[PDB]
Amino acid sequence: QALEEEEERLEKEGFYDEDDEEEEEILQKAEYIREQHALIRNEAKMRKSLKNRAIIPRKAVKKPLSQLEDHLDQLGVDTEAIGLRARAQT
Amino acid sequence: ASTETDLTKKKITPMGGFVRYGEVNNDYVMIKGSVPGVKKRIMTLRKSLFTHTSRKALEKVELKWIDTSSEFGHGAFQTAAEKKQFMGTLKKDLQT
């Protein structure tokens, strides 16, 4: 009986009661940023084997124009407005 | 799997199921001791060929408790409700 009276008093006082779109949006954006960081780290893990060999320097490897154009397009640069075709050697 | 002194409403199948068998949903026979087969195997139960001579055949069995904890490890809980009540609230409970 004492326990039930305590339960009624707590329920009257609001002991068991239970309770933002901007916060939800910023949490979703941070989750997207963490996913992008994980993808970048996976790329680095794929391209790095520094225990067994050294990475070939970037200046010694010819970079494909299609890959450069695709990466700049994903970054949001108008490649046609800058004319990447005349720059690329053959 | 309940008895007169253990009032928990529970079935014979252990927590997580019988290992490499599944669940017992049909009628079952509980035999004292061990039997020649393995799990999943056909068992032939036969009437005894002779009238018995021991008092063990005349004894009536009174079960106080049947274990229904997990046999996939060191199971300490007979029901999922008992495991939850001992454990308390988990992180995924508030996450849900």
Binding site: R34, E35, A38, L39, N42, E43, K45, M46 | -
Partner: protein
Amino acid sequence: AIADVVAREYTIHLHKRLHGVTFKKRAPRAIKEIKKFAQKAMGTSDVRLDPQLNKKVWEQGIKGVPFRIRVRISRRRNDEEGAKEKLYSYVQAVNVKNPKGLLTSVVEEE
């Protein structure tokens, strides 16, 4: 109902296929399990594995194969003359945040 040229992304659970394997055979065995998985999934006995996928398998040495791996299997047409099989599968490794918790998904052609 399914076309010949089709690409799907799968999660291969290599842990249960490499359970108990001799340590010096685990990565080659995982290569063969990837080939067998692709052959079972696509119906093609000609399976070709991307070298980046091979690097991903051998990333942690001969006995450090990952438990799960996300792959893209692309059934394509063999255009070479005098080929034994009309179709083949090409398997690549997929850059994902976490290989766990992913369903099989059809990759859009565009």
